[PDB]
Design a protein around this ligand. Structure first.
Ligand SMILES: [Mg+2]
Ligand SMILES: [Mg+2]
Ligand SMILES: [Mg+2]
Ligand SMILES: [Mg+2]
Ligand SMILES: [Mg+2]
Ligand SMILES: [Mg+2]
Ligand SMILES: [Mg+2]
Ligand SMILES: [Mg+2]
Lengths: 56, 117, 55, 151
RNA sequence: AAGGCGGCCCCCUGGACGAAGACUGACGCUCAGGUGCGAAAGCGUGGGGAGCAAACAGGAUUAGAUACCCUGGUAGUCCACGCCGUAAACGAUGUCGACUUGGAGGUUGUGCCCUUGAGGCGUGGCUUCCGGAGCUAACGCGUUAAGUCGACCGCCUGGGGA
């Protein structure tokens, strides 16, 4: 996420724009996922469980 | 002593600590401050307030060079990601750009085992 | 019909950071999302498209 | 206060100047259900405060009260095992109640000859913002600006 | 085929499926014994070694703590050529064939129709969720059967001992 602060735009709006760009790019989510090792069996188990949850 | 005016706000936000380094545009360090070095330990070290004071101590340590405008570079997760940028603007700096530079491997090294707590 | 040389069309299916946009967002067909990803990767290698938003 | 949503008991005004705010103040100072001796201390303190500050008995109270009145305070909350202090904007009614409570408590902690003298010298210290009561609003402020991130 | 297989490019190569005819003329199904393949760990020889990490060392926690947590870290994890032949090797469901109401998707062929920068109507292969009869001890299964039948094989016969 690369955010460029615009003319006559407050700091509060620029930071909120950055926080949304990080949320869109999944910055904190990709760091949470890579922090610790996950077994192929575990990531396959998670993918199956999420696919079942995506049925309402 | 010298004159820069246009700088770079390099902030290393880890889960345990926040290291704030003010550098020039080329990547040469001018002054730094950390949450751990600002009189905060363990429980209080890993707080956005300890990161706010780290941005404040860093601002006092670089105003002899005389910086007016600086572009922010955010690395890592944890607290002090946004509280450092907030403390830099309130200190008396014009934020040029806010960029996330968190390292993301294209699936490289095997991370350490999950902590069984 | 899809080609790595057509960096014009290719730029519509990649994000601000250079990441390939998933089929769920773009609404493309399964067969052609695979054809796209190959072309984006072919164009990335040939420095016709970037890998990351750093360089 | 789990299910029942209650209001607030409207107390009778001050028998001297007809002020509801002073009636809250006399009650805050009041101990052992002795209202007679409680207003006697509040009036003697106001009589010695206005005389030694240039009249306006109601206005001299308001000058001392404006300095102790807090704007923001922290609220204790336990999210995930950890106790986070969330800064919350205090309502105008409680703004005055905290201001009055700290004046009474700081005057009680004083070493003067009488409670009327202790109260008057506490209101005099608050009017010029240099006492125990104004420092309680100061400590509450430093606590709020610190946890400003968790707002 | 199972084990398993994921950046990109080429070379060598196996299988599957569709459309249209032509050709062979029961050449088929199953398979004890036999043969081959077969995750990870482990073994042998020589390489390689960034990260991770059995063992081991140190710091903590605890009543103890040969653990969980932290700082390190050797084999190993990687490559070549051999070996080993096991897993909750699982759909805990042997293979092949025929027959039996339906609904909503996903994926991959193909015939047709339109002025199409998409859809409309069919017809194959695979796949997911739901469900009818029937089946089942129940849970559930339900044209990808655990339904209705047939061919052949493997296997079970109370728990522990094993
Ligand atoms: Mg003939
Ligand atoms: Mg070896
Ligand atoms: Mg360890
Ligand atoms: Mg060995
Ligand atoms: Mg066995
Ligand atoms: Mg039924
Ligand atoms: Mg069913
Ligand atoms: Mg027996």
């Amino acid at each position: 996420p690369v955010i460029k602060v615009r003319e006559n735009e407050p700091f509060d709006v620029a930071l909120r724009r950055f926080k949304r760009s990080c949320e869109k790019a999944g910055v904190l989510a990709e760091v949470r996922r890579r922090e610790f090792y996950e077994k192929p069996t575990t990531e396959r188990k998670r993918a199956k469980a999420s696919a079942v949850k995506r049925h309402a | 002593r010298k004159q820069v005016s246009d700088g770079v706000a390099h902030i290393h936000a880890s889960f345990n600590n926040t290291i704030v380094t003010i550098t020039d545009r080329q990547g040469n360090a001018l002054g730094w401050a950390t949450a751990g070095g600002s009189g905060f330990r363990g429980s209080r070290k890993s707080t956005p307030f300890a990161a706010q004071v780290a941005a404040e101590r860093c601002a006092d340590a670089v105003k002899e060079y005389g910086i007016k405008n600086l572009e922010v570079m955010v690395k890592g997760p944890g607290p002090g990601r946004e509280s450092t940028i907030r403390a830099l603007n309130a200190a008396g700096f014009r934020i040029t750009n806010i960029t996330d530079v968190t390292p993301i491997p294209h699936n490289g090294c095997r991370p350490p085992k999950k902590r069984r707590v | 019909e899809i080609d790595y040389k057509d960096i014009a069309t290719l730029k519509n299916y990649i994000t601000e950071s250079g990441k390939i946009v998933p089929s769920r967002i773009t609404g493309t067909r399964a067969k052609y999302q695979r054809q796209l990803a190959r072309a984006i990767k072919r164009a990335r290698y040939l420095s016709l498209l970037p890998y990351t938003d750093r360089h | 206060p789990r299910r029942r949503v209650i209001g607030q008991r409207k107390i009778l005004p001050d028998p001297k100047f007809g002020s509801e705010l002073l009636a809250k103040f006399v009650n805050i100072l009041m101990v052992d259900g002795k209202k007679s001796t409680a207003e006697s201390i509040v009036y003697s303190a106001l009589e010695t405060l206005a005389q030694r500050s240039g009249k306006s008995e109601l206005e001299a109270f308001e000058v001392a009260l404006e300095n102790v009145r807090p704007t923001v305070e922290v609220k204790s909350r336990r999210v995930g095992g950890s106790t986070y202090q969330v800064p919350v904007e205090v309502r105008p009614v409680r703004r005055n109640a905290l201001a009055m409570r700290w004046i009474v408590e700081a005057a009680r902690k004083r070493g003067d000859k009488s409670m009327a003298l202790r109260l008057a010298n506490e209101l005099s210290d608050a009017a010029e913002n240099k006492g125990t009561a104004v420092k309680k609003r100061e400590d509450v402020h430093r606590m709020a600006e610190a946890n400003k991130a968790f707002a």
